[PDB]
Design an enzyme around this catalytic site. Structure first.
Site: not given
Ligand code: JZL
Ligand code: JZL
Lengths: 445, 446
Positions: A203, A209, A236, A292
């Site tokens: 995390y 982003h 998100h 996409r």
């Molecule tokens: N490793 C990380 O700290 C992390 C954190 C977030 N917040 C992640 C993050 C990593 N990855 C994701 N999303 C992809 C995801 C969600 C659930 C399961 C697998 C995946 Cl690949 N997200 C969620 C996001 C929503 C908006 C914040 C910035 C980018 C993201 O779209």
């Protein structure tokens, strides 16, 4: 060129695709629910087919009805836009086996990038830097999971392999919460995505982003079209997007871009795609790839001059990329404000009739919306009704133009996030640039 | 850098709104001066301060020099933007503005006076190296033997033109000696009645010319640049309908040649602000006709292809700032087309006033909409027919035209008659799609 295409979407994106089709002399088939007869693009299309009642499951997500409308109209291709069936590999495979052209990547590529575990494995192999994590699925052995958590660096996150965007995540602060967390995510993932596979990831505390736009012909050519900063988020969900990302040097752009371009060749990518990263301390960490077009594609179009939808259409027609990497130049700056039919304070969606509408105008002002005076925003769909895109020679000019354009935008009869957008444009930290992904929630708190 | 605190927008409609947006981007406070008929104008509704300057007729409102200057004084404004039309080329107004201690957003009054006198303006251009139409190179006398000798040297057909004339007023074509004396006498009488100046000159009449104009910017620091050209040939009875930039068939070498000559002429005459050198173009040759000493209606097509905000440059120059860009930084990229949208009857070409019941603006990539109109707005019968401008950009001419066709089809203006259908017809015209049509084309088509 493709003679006739089915636009398998609605709202602003369907209108975006329709304009691109008309520019190229491609005939349009607008497939719509019974609730979407009055959509602007439906009224502008050459042919219209009602594909079922209002709920998406019965219309926009109804594969046989979409295939049947494409067969009946004599169409040769289907553009799924974003959302709905755009990232559904079974739809892509069916479209192709039925003999139509799918305006998107190959079904196998959708499956590869769609499954988050294999996507990261593919990116690591390709040479794309990823977020340190489990590097494979998680088991029932708590001793192996705890040893992995200490290896990465606490805090950690439990992510659904079949999840994506803002769904299927759970943060872990310590080992005490770890067991309960790995179990809750598995139960939610099996119920929501019909797949209980999970993985662990670091995390990141203070990330931005940053995402990379790509175009690949599926013939061996792949180009990168700079980056976008989509850090202004709430629950998100993106609120503001901009291109290029502030603080990204031509050297940083070249480094990450070439890696993304190489990854396209290595996975046999076809069409338009986006590689999403978390950018912290001058380093990029891959999270996911959207296979996409994205909602925020217009900010990239403004700064490169490349029409991303027309390129999707040219690639789908079998044309190799005419645009060479050396022809892609970042010029000026663009900001996008998403316009939602919702109360920003409460997140309460605001469907209903628009009694008064007035779009902004002027130099560098781009309005992307199907909305009009007298139009009813249906309660059956997402809140996003439009996008306001402003371009300028520098970041300050684009922001100045956005403040002026937001002041001219009139949407009465429903609640919108227009006032929230004015607050963001007036925010001194946003004006400075480089605010992280947690900024918007902190500011509103 | 220092910027103007507050300005009076001495105009109305689309240009007043265009100027307001540029002011807001620069943090300049706005003063909307308006007639009693123009209280519901979009820019008036968005302005920081408003001043009603008189009743509907332009003589008592938009042409009212004391009321406009008085509104600048009352509001504590520092500058006046005349826009286009109205008092923009009025040298007495610009003199009165300077005299009253306010900045006139335009050139010096004496420069307006010089370029406003067509005989003196040609002599200044010829001296500077700007190519001119072969002509009398001075005023015509009453001696008809001398006038027949000038006409024979030029070679018929010729055109008799008023020194106080301009645009589409104060001229008469002569095809032979038989019509010469009467045509000169008639031009003199018309010039005396309209301009209180009976001075006329002779010019060679060109059969199939294109109307091609060069955009310039000049600051108070001695810098003067050219911002390519515009083709305004798609017109009918001295009224532009479609303008485009750059002009088809013009090579980069031809652009450089004419542009450098225009930039040098600015320096020689001590030009300041935005300006346009108007030319008739025929057989790969440029011929100067007149200089517009203000911003033009069609300025957005130049903005799309260069990236330069021409209104913001006017405001920067007036504030005493240098030009924000150098010549080497000016690059022609892509193509832009402008369709003027008028509340006019297509059979008569006369203004068609009334209330707009339903209004929808087009959108999309490369689409620009310049208008003050909104649903419920009433087009007043007191002013010109122009209600808006539709501008489409593309990486090449074909894309710009394709985007225009789609934009026009999305444009909804109900309750009043418009030229929207005519604009759709021009976009569909194969000769226009090929490009390079002359000034006479539209009249011949209609
Ligand atoms: N490793 C990380 O700290 C992390 C954190 C977030 N917040 C992640 C993050 C990593 N990855 C994701 N999303 C992809 C995801 C969600 C659930 C399961 C697998 C995946 Cl690949 N997200 C969620 C996001 C929503 C908006 C914040 C910035 C980018 C993201 O779209
Ligand atoms: N020398 C010529 O061939 C010539 C011809 C015309 N028609 C001229 C033309 C020359 N010059 C002018 N106008 C300027 C003018 C008029 C009267 C007195 C002095 C001037 Cl400078 N005009 C009027 C035109 C209006 C029609 C379309 C666009 C081109 C021109 O504006």
């Amino acid at each position: 060129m493709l003679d006739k295409i089915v636009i398998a979407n609605r709202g602003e994106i369907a209108l975006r695709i329709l304009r691109a089709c008309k520019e190229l002399g491609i005939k349009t088939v607008a497939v719509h629910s019974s609730a979407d007869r009055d959509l602007k693009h439906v009224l502008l299309a050459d042919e219209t087919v009602c594909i079922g009642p209002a709920p998406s499951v019965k219309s926009y997500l109804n594969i046989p009805a979409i295939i049947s409308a494409a067969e009946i109209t004599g169409a040769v291709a289907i553009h799924p836009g974003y959302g709905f069936l755009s990232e559904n590999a079974n739809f892509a495979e069916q479209v192709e086996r039925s003999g139509f052209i799918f305006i998107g990547p190959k079904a196998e590529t959708i499956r590869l990038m769609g499954d988050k575990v294999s996507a990261i494995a593919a990116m690591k192999k390709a040479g794309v830097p990823c977020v340190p994590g489990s590097d494979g699925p998680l088991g029932d052995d708590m001793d192996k999971n705890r040893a992995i958590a200490k290896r990465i660096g606490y805090p950690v996150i439990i992510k659904a392999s079949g999840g994506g965007g803002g769904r299927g995540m759970r943060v872990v602060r310590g080992d005490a919460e770890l067991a309960q967390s790995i179990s809750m995510t598995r139960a939610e993932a099996k119920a929501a995505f019909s797949n209980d596979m999970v993985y662990m990831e670091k995390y990141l505390e203070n990330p931005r982003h940053v995402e990379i736009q790509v175009l690949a012909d599926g013939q061996g050519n792949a180009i990168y079209l700079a980056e976008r900063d989509c850090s202004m988020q709430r629950r998100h969900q993106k609120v503001v997007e901009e291109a290029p990302a502030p603080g990204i040097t031509p050297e940083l752009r070249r480094y990450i871009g070439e890696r993304c371009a190489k990854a396209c060749v290595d996975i046999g990518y076809r069409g338009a795609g986006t590689f999403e990263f978390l950018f912290e301390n001058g380093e990029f960490y891959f999270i996911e790839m959207n296979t996409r077009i994205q909602v925020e594609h217009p900010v990239t179009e403004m700064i490169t001059g490349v029409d991303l939808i027309k390129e999707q259409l040219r690639i789908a027609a079998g044309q190799p990329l005419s645009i060479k990497q050396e022809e892609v130049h970042v010029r000026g700056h663009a900001v996008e404000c998403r316009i939602n039919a919702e109360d920003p304070n409460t997140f309460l969606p605001s469907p209903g009739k628009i009694t008064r509408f007035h779009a902004p105008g002027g130099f560098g002002v781009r309005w992307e919306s199907h909305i009009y005076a007298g139009y009813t925003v249906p309660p059956y769909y997402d809140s996003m009704i439009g996008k306001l895109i402003c371009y300028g020679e520098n970041r300050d000019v684009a922001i100045a133009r956005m403040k002026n354009a937001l002041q001219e935008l009139i949407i009465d009869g429903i609640k919108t996030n227009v006032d929230l957008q004015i607050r963001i444009m007036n925010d001194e930290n946003f004006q400075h640039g480089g605010t992280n992904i947690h900024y918007l929630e902190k500011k509103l708190g």
